[model samples]
Target: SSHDKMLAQPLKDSDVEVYNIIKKESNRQRVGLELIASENFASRAVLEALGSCLNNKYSEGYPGQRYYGGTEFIDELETLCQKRALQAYKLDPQCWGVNVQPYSGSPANFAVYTALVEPHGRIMGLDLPDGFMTDKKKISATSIFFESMPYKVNPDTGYINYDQLEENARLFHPKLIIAGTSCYSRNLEYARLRKIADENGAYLMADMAHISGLVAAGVVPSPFEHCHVVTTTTHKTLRGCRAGMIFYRKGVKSVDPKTGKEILYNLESLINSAVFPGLQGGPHNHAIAGVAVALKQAMTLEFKVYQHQVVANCRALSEALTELGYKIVTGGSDNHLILVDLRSKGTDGGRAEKVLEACSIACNKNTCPGDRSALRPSGLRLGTPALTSRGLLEKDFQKVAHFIHRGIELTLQIQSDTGVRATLKEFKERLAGDKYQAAVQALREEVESFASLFPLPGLP
Candidate 1:
């Protein structure tokens, strides 16, 4: 493995600091079961690409030409990436283009917003609690750009209220309508959303950062058919490197009233300029290379099968949790993720998150529709991506679900029983102390033995 090779080297004295951090991160992923909704295990090829000599170049512009000289090879790399992306999405090369930059999802989103919407133009989307955006305090349309509106979700099912969304469009007349959510479980009604956008004279943008992999794998409807523009993270369901993409539909033209004729606005150029000048400076060439490799991998038959299994595993996991008396948002999932409302567990999402981490299962605390405080949310967001990547199937999901249930129950019991909490703290302290470090070592050995049973795909 590349990690082993890195460690085997006689490191330079000055390289010790960087090597130490790399070693720590390598151990973390090797042992940890990452369940974060927005996380995925990139392939070793993708990692290798990210660490390649492409990182040494500085290409300040798009392919075929650049401000800096000696960009011939980098230009080919960028063009090849764009072509692969276009092929994966069935986009027309002549009419469509991509800017393989935009440091990450947030900047990609911001670039689209700046290109399409005028300053202070009303922007309507699903409520933040519905999982449309992360860091609602920082990146919200209202907070970051001074204009925003929210469409409501059905509290009972966790599905979008299309009628309410239509009502909002009728009232606010927003210039941009975003039909994407960070935590939504069901497939979006893109055609209906497009109708709303047309009615309100709005441009529709589908941020498919979560389900791009599903769409690419044909498990969900592609946003290209219905939205004027689409933005997505190359990671997440796409299972690529940590990067972002912005795409537009083909032959999309707008008329300029002042010119009294139709005009072709190069939306792709606008996106590129917004990303390069309006948002970021130079592109991360290595990350872009990683993305290219992943995109190539995503085009294979095996990836489609993997995508299907991801959804199946999610359904099985959701069913197992629901049978154990958990309230699942949306009743279940249509994709790779599941959100469990943990209110009935008599514990907050934050506490559940900590307990699960202690057991070596990774996940995040998330907010439900009626969550009282954002800090102590009502839901524990879980997913099947990491476990699925580890070759876990339906039967394995049943076992994992039971472990999750037990972990949650243990956490709740500790919260209620003061005696148990005190005992646990004392036990943990003793296990970490000199006298009990041997026992702790034994336990760590057991964890490694257990995790080894579920060897992740693409890893030895």
Candidate 2:
């Protein structure tokens, strides 16, 4: 509280440079459409916790077992976060114990692998375009530390081939199996995945990073009923500050084969140790505090309704785009995200992304199932979490979808006028050219006019 009175204009007076950068970014967010699938607006309450006095602490270990002093309040805060994380998902504490220390989703997943799988152990996950076992290219680097086998989707349908996965798992005999997706548009078959893991004597881990909020709302199926491990980012659908949590099953994992007795799961200690001494150092208490606040917010009935609306808006957007001749991956979305395959539209995702950004409609380019390269991909990933947070509904999303359709059309038009299908770099260069500037600026004015109607959440 004392820091509040340090100066009447602390940030602006003390650091005008960074303050101006933040102000400009805030204005940009306020004026533009935020369609990035992995992005959302954290509530002001959560933001307050992230910028709190807790940042001064150095809580290096779990609650009541810290390696440093003066952690009395920090321990209480972290323990509350762990409890709320489990409660948000309706997980039983006796069967599940969560570690909230992971810095983000990637580290959280790595901690799970470090705890459960041995070095160079074999693991299976969905092929790159459908799911990020650990991002597409990063998996190549991770291949040095651990061996991996990929189970691919049916590229035409954008659905995983369960029979193919079962056969692959049997042949590969992996130590771990991951059931998750980054660009997949349909629900996963957790029970089938569990069966495959059990048959192959592998542990199943679910990365619900993208859909954790819907899962918490009970709008989507929960992974806790079957998977031994679950990991998620607090920022994505959970709408928290950037942080991560790992949930591991604590009860019996499987029966001992030779001994004919129960084999207990020691995931609690192993995962805790892996996150601490094995991976990270002092935990970010401020981020943990932010997650605690977000978890509390997620427990509300309103949050449930908001999550349902997010899905509804996404469905609306997908259908509208499809009606405009945009080919949606897997036909449509079941969650917040929609992947638009741009190959049929005579343009690629990279060019489309540049054109959309020029018009203040923000989204990311991603690879589709049949894309050969991650770079220069043929797909665009758009989501409704941030838009829904801004109070955009099904009707509003239909209009937003038309904007996207127009953006893609503009890309094709620019290509036609120039008589060259420019690469991403060349497209960026041409974005400012007089030939394309008028169209981009005109659409941007329309987009800004539309975006100004909705108020961004968590802004003072």
Candidate 3:
């Protein structure tokens, strides 16, 4: 009986320190506001798959074509994941193929570049002061391997500047053109990007990482109709495990003009090899299974209803915050995310983020258009996916906006107490001082009580 108990609860008994840390984090999530745009809660079913024995396998290569010996079941699992991925997006198998083995979003993009573009090839990707940080950062890191030119958004309006993007693409003569965003909230013009790519003789790759779920639910524009390739992480709005997928058209790619050589679509093989042997050795079978489970759930009518609510909740929060005198970037959101400029409140994003966290609200400080410093930016990014998963609806999100406004007001008060612009360290010290402790703590209690009313999904 003791042996059975030990086998069932090994981590709890053997590593109480680690177990307690996990328990504390669980409680933290239970009692706080999770408004980070790139986060979502996985269902208990997805977690079950992630924690299963499928983790202990090495399945190198695609389904039914693995280099490893013990990959029969792994093949079935990966194949099913791919099938569900295509079905979730409503793609015809004959026209499109998907690779569900990249470790995450960045790697998926890397694999696409490795497969499609030659080394040191020119690329034009979206670049904004506040938007597409991940894409911009990754392109900068990979600049040594790929010559890159980045396009910008309108600094004042915070909208993607298509004319500028086109001008840059033509001047750069890029081999690849990326259409994506990490912080921007407006709908993308995938068709316009496709046109730009065609005129520049580049491959159009859409990184719909932030809005994949909305696209899947048909609440946002689908990139599949225009982009030659699409890549996304399986978490975030998808509410799945951490994984990535690359979708590509399975038709004639192009024909070379000089030699009259036909360049057929080789994305299926090239991207698969790039993911398998080029970048990673073994596929994460557990993550693939988790993604499969999520994609299956995503196809249901209930999931569509949930996605629509995610959008509705986002708009509600945006409108409420605007009414409270907070400035929302791009005017409003067309999807699940909104960026708040904290400069209007006379506090920087860093201070606002600290104050909000002290009050049990979780979010990230981000850059805004024309921001001078990356570390101490002027914006905060919020999303509804994680909170919406807790069954908080539009009304609840409006209430969440008030909670955020309170946090912002506290920062302004702390700033005014100094009678001048205080350094970040000074601002933090004042927030922890005795005078403001009561206020921040009271806000924490309010937020905890409000968040507790909604049951957090995917927890026992």
Task: Give me the candidate number with maximum lDDT.
Answer: 2
For residues 315-370, write the lDDT of model 1, one tens digit per residue: 77777887888888655666777777777657767666655666566887777765
Off by over 4 Å in 2: 1-9, 132-141, 254-260, 372-376, 420-427
lDDT tens readout by residue for model 2, 388-456: 888888887777877877787798887787656455666677777887688788889989988899998
Could you tell which candidate, 1 or 2, scores higher by TM-score?
Answer: 2
| TM-score per model over all chains | 0.84, 0.91, 0.91
Displacement of residue 223 (Cα, Å) in model 1 is: 1.4
Q: Where is model 3 more than 4 Å wrong at Cα? A: 1-9, 128-139, 156-158, 254-263, 372-376
lDDT of 2 at 328: 69
